[PDB]
C-alpha cells in the first residue's frame, strides 16, 4: 500500500496527488479474526481511508450514544457504485501518460482502489462532449441502415471500458442513457432547445427511435460489450424547457409511458437484447412519486420496466421520504437506482473546488440518505474532469472526484473520491441493508449492511465539528467502542461468525 500525497489549494482539506509513478493505493483486502473489527478513517484534517483495528468488547456500561445492529430487519440488496464514461472523462484520462492512465483506472475499479462496479455510458453526445453528434445523423434513414459508432466510442470510450473490466475486482455492470435523438426525428430539428420526438408513440419516429436502442446495443456487442440496463432518456423533463442549452429530448410522464408501452418495451423484447433491463425516469426525485404512478399504473408499460433511475443535483440536502420513500411503498418490487450525481454551483461561484471537504460530505450524506430509503445503487457523473470542470461544449462545468492536469501528467483525488470509496470499496453487490437504531437523537448519519458472506459493514459520517463518542452493538459478537471525530467519515467492518 502507498499513502496519500496531500496538496492544498485554498479550501478546507487536501487532494491526493498521483502521477505516472505514484498513486495512493490499498493492499489486498484482508478480514481480521472474529472478535476484532476494522476501521477505515477519512478526516478533513487529512486522513485518507486509513486502516486501524480493535477488539470487540463483551460488555458496555456508559451512557453516550449506542447504535444497535438489527440483523434480522432486512431491506434492499445493493446493485453497486460507479461513475460515467463521458467523452470528457475519456479525453481527460487519455491525456495522461499510459502508466498514469492505469493508476487512475486502478484507483476506481481494482481492489487496490475503491472497487467500482458500475459504468454509465452516454449514447452519443451530451454536454460533456466537445463535438455534437448522434449515431444516425444521415437524415430520414428510418431503418437506420447508416447507424454507426464514431471514434468517440470506438477509439476512446470502448477501449477504456474494456481496460476497466480487465482491472476490476468485481463484475462490472454497464448502463446506457441517450441525451438526444437524431435531429430529423425531433419537432425542433436541433439537438438542444425545447423539443420531443415528432408525432406520437407507435408511429415511424417513435419506432425508429426505439430501433436506435437496438442498433446501439448491436454495435457495442460487436465490440464485446454488453449492458445490464438502459434508461428510457436522460433527464426527459429537460427537453420540455424553452431554450434548453444542450442535448435533450423532452417527454412528459404520459409520453414516456406510451413510448415504453408502444415502442421501446416491445422493440427491446423482440430483439436479442431482451435480457437488458429498462429503467424509467432518469431524472430528479421531485418528479416522484407522480412519474412512477403515471408509468407503472399502466400495465402495458409496467410489464417492461425493471426499475426507476433517479438523479441527484442541487438537492443533496433535501428530504427523501416523500419522494424515494413513498415510491418504494407504492412499488416495493420496482428497484430504485441513483444513476447520476454531481455537485453543481451558482452561476457566479466556482465549478471545481480542489480539496473541498464540504463536497465530500455532500456525496456521503446523499449516499446514506439513498440507502436509507431503499435505493440499490449510486452512480457518480464524469469519472474525471480537468481543473476547469470540463471540457464541456456549453461550458456547463461541474466538479468530479478526480481532476486531471495534463500539463503536469498528474491527477488529483478529491475528498468526493474517498467519501464515495467509503461505500463502494466495502459494499459489494448483493449486500443487504439491515436495521440500525440509535439510543438517543444525534447528528450522525449512519447505515448498516450485511455482506453476502454474512459480515457486517457500518458507515458513520460526522458532518459536525464535534467529536461524538459512540458504541455499536451487534448481539452476535458484542460491542464496538469508538469515537466519531468531527468532520470525519468511518467505515467499520467485522466478522459475525
Amino acid at each position, epitope marked *: 500500500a502507498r499513502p496519500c500525497i496531500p496538496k492544498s489549494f485554498g479550501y478546507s482539506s487536501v487532494v491526493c496527488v498521483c502521477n505516472a509513478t505514484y498513486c495512493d493505493s490499498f493492499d489486498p483486502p484482508t478480514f481480521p479474526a472474529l472478535g476484532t473489527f476494522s476501521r477505515y478513517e477519512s478526516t478533513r484534517s487529512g486522513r485518507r481511508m486509513e486502516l486501524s483495528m480493535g477488539p470487540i468488547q463483551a460488555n458496555h456500561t456508559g451512557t453516550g450514544l449506542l447504535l444497535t445492529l438489527q440483523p434480522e430487519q432486512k431491506f434492499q*440488496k445493493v*446493485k453497486g457504485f460507479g461513475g460515467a464514461m463521458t467523452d470528457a472523462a475519456a479525453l481527460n484520462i487519455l491525456a495522461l501518460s499510459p502508466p498514469a492512465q492505469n493508476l487512475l483506472l486502478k484507483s476506481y475499479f481494482s481492489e487496490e482502489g475503491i472497487g467500482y462496479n458500475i*459504468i454509465r455510458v452516454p449514447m452519443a453526445s451530451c454536454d460533456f462532449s466537445i463535438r455534437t453528434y448522434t449515431y444516425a445523423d444521415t437524415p430520414d434513414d428510418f431503418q437506420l441502415h447508416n447507424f454507426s459508432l464514431p471514434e468517440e466510442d470506438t477509439k476512446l470510450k470502448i477501449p477504456l*471500458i*474494456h481496460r476497466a*473490466l480487465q482491472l476490476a475486482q*468485481r*463484475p*462490472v*455492470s*454497464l448502463l446506457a442513457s441517450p441525451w438526444t435523438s437524431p435531429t430529423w426525428l425531433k419537432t425542433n430539428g436541433a439537438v438542444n432547445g425545447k423539443g420531443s420526438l415528432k408525432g406520437q408513440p407507435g408511429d415511424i419516429y417513435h419506432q425508429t427511435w426505439a430501433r436506435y436502442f437496438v442498433k446501439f446495443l448491436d454495435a457495442y*456487442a460487436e465490440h*464485446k*460489450l*454488453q449492458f*445490464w440496463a438502459v434508461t428510457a432518456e436522460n433527464e426527459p423533463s429537460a427537453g420540455l424547457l424553452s431554450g434548453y442549452p444542450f442535448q435533450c429530448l423532452g417527454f412528459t410522464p404520459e409520453h414516456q409511458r406510451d413510448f415504453i408501452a408502444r415502442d421501446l418495451g416491445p422493440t427491446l423484447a423482440n430483439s*436479442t437484447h*431482451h*435480457n437488458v*433491463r429498462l429503467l424509467m425516469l432518469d431524472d430528479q426525485r421531485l418528479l416522484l412519486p407522480h412519474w412512477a404512478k403515471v408509468v407503472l399504473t399502466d400495465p402495458e408499460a409496467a410489464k417492461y420496466v*425493471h426499475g426507476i433511475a433517479v438523479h441527484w443535483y442541487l438537492d443533496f440536502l433535501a428530504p427523501a421520504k416523500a419522494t424515494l420513500g413513498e415510491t418504494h411503498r407504492l412499488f416495493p*418490487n420496482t*428497484m430504485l437506482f441513483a444513476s447520476e450525481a454531481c455537485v453543481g454551483s451558482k452561476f457566479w461561484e466556482q465549478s471545481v473546488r480542489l480539496g473541498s471537504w464540504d463536497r465530500g460530505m455532500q456525496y456521503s450524506h446523499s449516499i446514506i440518505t439513498n440507502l436509507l430509503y431503499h435505493v440499490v445503487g449510486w452512480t457518480d457523473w464524469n469519472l474525471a474532469l480537468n481543473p476547469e470542470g470540463g471540457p464541456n461544449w456549453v461550458r456547463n462545468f461541474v466538479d468530479s472526484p478526480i481532476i486531471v492536469d495534463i500539463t503536469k501528467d498528474t491527477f488529483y483525488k478529491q475528498p468526493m473520491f474517498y467519501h464515495l470509496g467509503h461505500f463502494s470499496k466495502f459494499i459489494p*453487490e*448483493g449486500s443487504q441493508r439491515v436495521g440500525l437504531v440509535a439510543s438517543q437523537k444525534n447528528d450522525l448519519d449512519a447505515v448498516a449492511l450485511m455482506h*453476502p458472506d454474512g459480515s457486517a459493514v457500518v458507515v458513520v459520517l460526522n458532518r459536525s465539528s464535534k467529536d461524538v463518542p459512540l458504541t455499536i452493538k451487534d448481539p452476535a459478537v458484542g460491542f464496538l467502542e469508538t469515537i466519531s471525530p468531527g468532520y470525519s467519515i468511518h467505515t467499520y467492518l467485522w466478522h459475525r461468525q
Partner: nanobody
Framework: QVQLVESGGGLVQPGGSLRLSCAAS????????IGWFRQAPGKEREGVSC????????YYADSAKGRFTISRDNAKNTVYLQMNSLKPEDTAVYYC???????????????????????WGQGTQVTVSS
C-alpha cells in the same frame, strides 16, 4: 464446501420435455446466483438460463426464451430447468454453476463473460433423438 449436482438428464424424443435439477450444498440460494449452461459437441460452452439471488429475476438465451423456465425451490435449495419442445439441436451436456455476480454471463460488461462463474457441476447429458 461448495457442491453442485446436476440430475434429470436422459434421452427424449423431439418435441418432448425434461426437467433438470441443480442441487446446491455448502451455501444457500439467497447467496449465489445460479446459471444453467450447455455444451453441444463441437461448440463452446453457452449460457442457457440464469436466476439472480438479489431479486429472483431470470435471464435466458435466445434459444431458451419461451421454451425453458428456470425456477428455485427455496425449501430444498434446488434450481430447476424445465425444458419444453426439445429438438435434436438441444443435445448437449448441461451444467449448473455459481455466479460471483448476478447472472454475469448476460448482465456484466464483457459479452458472454464466463469469468465470474467460480464453481461448476460435472454436468448431465441430455440427448434428443428419434
Amino acid at each position: 464446501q461448495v457442491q453442485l449436482v446436476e440430475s434429470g438428464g436422459g434421452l427424449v424424443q423431439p418435441g418432448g420435455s425434461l426437467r433438470l435439477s441443480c442441487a446446491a450444498s455448502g451455501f444457500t440460494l439467497d447467496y449465489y446466483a445460479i446459471g444453467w449452461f450447455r455444451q453441444a459437441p463441437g461448440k463452446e460452452r453457452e449460457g442457457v438460463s440464469c436466476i439472480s439471488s438479489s431479486d429472483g429475476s431470470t435471464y435466458y438465451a435466445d434459444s431458451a426464451k419461451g421454451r425453458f423456465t428456470i425456477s428455485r425451490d427455496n425449501a430444498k435449495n434446488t434450481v430447476y430447468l424445465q425444458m419444453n419442445s426439445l429438438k435434436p439441436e438441444d443435445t448437449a451436456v448441461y451444467y449448473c454453476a455459481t455466479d460471483r455476480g448476478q447472472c454475469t454471463y448476460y448482465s456484466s460488461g464483457y459479452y458472454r463473460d464466463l469469468r465470474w462463474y467460480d464453481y461448476w457441476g460435472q454436468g448431465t447429458q441430455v440427448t434428443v433423438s428419434s
